[PDB]
Design a protein around this motif. Structure first.
Motif, mmCIF file in Angstrom:
data_model
loop_
_atom_site.group_PDB
_atom_site.id
_atom_site.type_symbol
_atom_site.label_atom_id
_atom_site.label_comp_id
_atom_site.label_asym_id
_atom_site.label_seq_id
_atom_site.Cartn_x
_atom_site.Cartn_y
_atom_site.Cartn_z
ATOM 1 N N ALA A 22 121.095 53.076 -28.108
ATOM 2 C CA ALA A 22 120.315 53.671 -27.025
ATOM 3 C C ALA A 22 121.180 54.573 -26.145
ATOM 4 C CB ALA A 22 119.638 52.590 -26.186
ATOM 5 N N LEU A 23 122.400 54.137 -25.848
ATOM 6 C CA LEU A 23 123.296 54.965 -25.046
ATOM 7 C C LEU A 23 123.678 56.233 -25.808
ATOM 8 C CD1 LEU A 23 125.577 52.197 -23.520
ATOM 9 C CD2 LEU A 23 123.752 53.472 -22.362
ATOM 10 N N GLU A 24 123.937 56.095 -27.102
ATOM 11 C CA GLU A 24 124.288 57.258 -27.903
ATOM 12 C C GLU A 24 123.156 58.271 -27.936
ATOM 13 O OE1 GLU A 24 124.745 56.630 -32.076
ATOM 14 O OE2 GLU A 24 125.340 58.723 -32.419
ATOM 15 N N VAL A 25 121.931 57.765 -28.062
ATOM 16 C CA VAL A 25 120.748 58.613 -28.093
ATOM 17 C C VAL A 25 120.581 59.350 -26.768
ATOM 18 C CG1 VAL A 25 118.229 58.615 -28.131
ATOM 19 C CG2 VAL A 25 119.504 57.311 -29.853
ATOM 20 N N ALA A 26 120.777 58.634 -25.666
ATOM 21 C CA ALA A 26 120.688 59.246 -24.345
ATOM 22 C C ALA A 26 121.675 60.408 -24.219
ATOM 23 C CB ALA A 26 120.933 58.208 -23.261
ATOM 24 N N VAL A 27 122.928 60.162 -24.593
ATOM 25 C CA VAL A 27 123.954 61.203 -24.578
ATOM 26 C C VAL A 27 123.595 62.373 -25.491
ATOM 27 C CG1 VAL A 27 126.307 61.799 -25.249
ATOM 28 C CG2 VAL A 27 125.867 59.689 -23.957
ATOM 29 N N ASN A 28 123.121 62.058 -26.689
ATOM 30 C CA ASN A 28 122.762 63.091 -27.652
ATOM 31 C C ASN A 28 121.661 63.999 -27.113
ATOM 32 O OD1 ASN A 28 121.226 64.291 -30.036
ATOM 33 N ND2 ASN A 28 123.009 63.420 -31.088
ATOM 34 N N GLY A 30 121.244 64.799 -24.132
ATOM 35 C CA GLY A 30 121.736 65.572 -23.007
ATOM 36 C C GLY A 30 121.661 64.889 -21.651
ATOM 37 N N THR A 31 121.397 63.587 -21.636
ATOM 38 C CA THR A 31 121.350 62.854 -20.373
ATOM 39 C C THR A 31 122.748 62.444 -19.911
ATOM 40 O OG1 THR A 31 121.072 60.624 -21.299
ATOM 41 C CG2 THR A 31 119.090 61.959 -21.016
ATOM 42 N N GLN A 32 122.986 62.550 -18.607
ATOM 43 C CA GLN A 32 124.263 62.151 -18.029
ATOM 44 C C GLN A 32 124.286 60.644 -17.797
ATOM 45 O OE1 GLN A 32 125.279 64.238 -14.432
ATOM 46 N NE2 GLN A 32 127.303 63.279 -14.252
ATOM 47 N N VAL A 33 124.950 59.928 -18.698
ATOM 48 C CA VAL A 33 124.997 58.472 -18.650
ATOM 49 C C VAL A 33 126.109 57.977 -17.729
ATOM 50 C CG1 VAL A 33 125.354 56.370 -19.986
ATOM 51 C CG2 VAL A 33 124.025 58.254 -20.961
ATOM 52 N N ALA A 34 125.745 57.114 -16.784
ATOM 53 C CA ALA A 34 126.704 56.550 -15.833
ATOM 54 C C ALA A 34 127.821 55.805 -16.553
ATOM 55 C CB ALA A 34 125.998 55.623 -14.857
ATOM 56 N N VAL A 35 129.051 55.957 -16.071
ATOM 57 C CA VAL A 35 130.189 55.299 -16.702
ATOM 58 C C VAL A 35 130.006 53.780 -16.797
ATOM 59 C CG1 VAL A 35 131.469 55.190 -14.527
ATOM 60 C CG2 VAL A 35 132.694 54.991 -16.702
ATOM 61 N N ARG A 36 129.312 53.187 -15.828
ATOM 62 C CA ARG A 36 129.135 51.734 -15.828
ATOM 63 C C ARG A 36 128.369 51.230 -17.052
ATOM 64 N NH1 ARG A 36 125.304 52.045 -11.293
ATOM 65 N NH2 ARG A 36 123.162 51.906 -12.108
ATOM 66 N N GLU A 37 127.518 52.075 -17.631
ATOM 67 C CA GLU A 37 126.783 51.682 -18.831
ATOM 68 C C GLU A 37 127.765 51.385 -19.959
ATOM 69 O OE1 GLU A 37 123.750 51.212 -18.110
ATOM 70 O OE2 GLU A 37 123.938 52.367 -16.261
ATOM 71 N N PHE A 38 128.715 52.291 -20.167
ATOM 72 C CA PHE A 38 129.704 52.117 -21.223
ATOM 73 C C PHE A 38 130.607 50.925 -20.923
ATOM 74 C CE2 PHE A 38 129.095 56.845 -20.949
ATOM 75 C CZ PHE A 38 128.220 56.918 -22.020
ATOM 76 N N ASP A 39 131.003 50.790 -19.663
ATOM 77 C CA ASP A 39 131.904 49.715 -19.279
ATOM 78 C C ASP A 39 131.230 48.348 -19.339
ATOM 79 O OD1 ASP A 39 134.034 51.398 -19.041
ATOM 80 O OD2 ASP A 39 133.905 51.614 -16.868
ATOM 81 N N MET A 40 129.972 48.270 -18.918
ATOM 82 C CA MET A 40 129.238 47.015 -19.036
ATOM 83 C C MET A 40 129.052 46.621 -20.499
ATOM 84 S SD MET A 40 126.279 46.828 -16.127
ATOM 85 C CE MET A 40 125.573 48.434 -16.474
ATOM 86 N N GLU A 74 134.698 50.240 -30.626
ATOM 87 C CA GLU A 74 135.167 51.576 -30.971
ATOM 88 C C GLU A 74 134.081 52.611 -30.711
ATOM 89 O OE1 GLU A 74 136.753 51.758 -34.901
ATOM 90 O OE2 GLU A 74 138.255 50.192 -34.546
ATOM 91 N N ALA A 75 132.849 52.288 -31.092
ATOM 92 C CA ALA A 75 131.731 53.196 -30.863
ATOM 93 C C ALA A 75 131.535 53.470 -29.371
ATOM 94 C CB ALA A 75 130.457 52.644 -31.481
ATOM 95 N N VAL A 76 131.670 52.431 -28.552
ATOM 96 C CA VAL A 76 131.522 52.584 -27.106
ATOM 97 C C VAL A 76 132.641 53.444 -26.524
ATOM 98 C CG1 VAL A 76 131.550 51.409 -24.872
ATOM 99 C CG2 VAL A 76 130.178 50.482 -26.763
ATOM 100 N N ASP A 77 133.875 53.182 -26.948
ATOM 101 C CA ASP A 77 135.015 53.992 -26.522
ATOM 102 C C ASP A 77 134.750 55.467 -26.798
ATOM 103 O OD1 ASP A 77 136.489 51.803 -25.683
ATOM 104 O OD2 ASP A 77 137.467 51.541 -27.633
ATOM 105 N N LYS A 78 134.248 55.749 -27.995
ATOM 106 C CA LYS A 78 133.988 57.120 -28.417
ATOM 107 C C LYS A 78 132.949 57.778 -27.519
ATOM 108 C CE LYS A 78 136.631 55.630 -31.560
ATOM 109 N NZ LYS A 78 137.575 54.576 -31.088
ATOM 110 N N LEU A 79 131.864 57.063 -27.242
ATOM 111 C CA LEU A 79 130.842 57.556 -26.328
ATOM 112 C C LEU A 79 131.415 57.844 -24.949
ATOM 113 C CD1 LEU A 79 127.516 55.607 -26.889
ATOM 114 C CD2 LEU A 79 128.154 57.934 -27.543
ATOM 115 N N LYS A 80 132.165 56.888 -24.413
ATOM 116 C CA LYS A 80 132.750 57.048 -23.092
ATOM 117 C C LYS A 80 133.652 58.275 -23.070
ATOM 118 C CE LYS A 80 135.178 54.609 -19.405
ATOM 119 N NZ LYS A 80 135.835 53.344 -18.981
#
Length: 84
Positions: A22-28, A30-40, A74-80
């Motif tokens: 879901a986070l990857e899709v949001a980024v893809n 073009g949505t600006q995803v808050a850093v806390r999403e990746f960190d959580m 690893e996937a989360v790191d990449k997104l962040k």
């Protein structure tokens, strides 16, 4: 029993796996995803790893789940990184 405990973790990792997509899709899209999403997401994955660490097993699936978590991390790191 260990089996139940590993299954419990698997269920939680499944939820986290869906969240990561879901986070990857949001980024893809073009949505600006808050850093806390990746960190959580990273934090919750680490908590599941700790849970597995404490399970004295069952050992095969436990080890399998550890690897799945490492892959998600690893996937989360990449997104962040992509959003940095």
């Amino acid at each position: 029993l260990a089996i139940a405990a590993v299954n419990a973790v698997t269920g939680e990792v499944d939820k986290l796996s869906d969240r990561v997509v879901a986070l990857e899709v949001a980024v893809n899209g073009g949505t600006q995803v808050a850093v806390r999403e990746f960190d959580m997401a990273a934090e919750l994955l680490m908590r599941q790893l700790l849970k597995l660490d404490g399970i004295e097993a069952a050992k095969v699936q436990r080890k399998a789940e550890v690897r799945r978590i490492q892959n998600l991390q690893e996937a989360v790191d990449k997104l962040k990184a992509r959003c940095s």
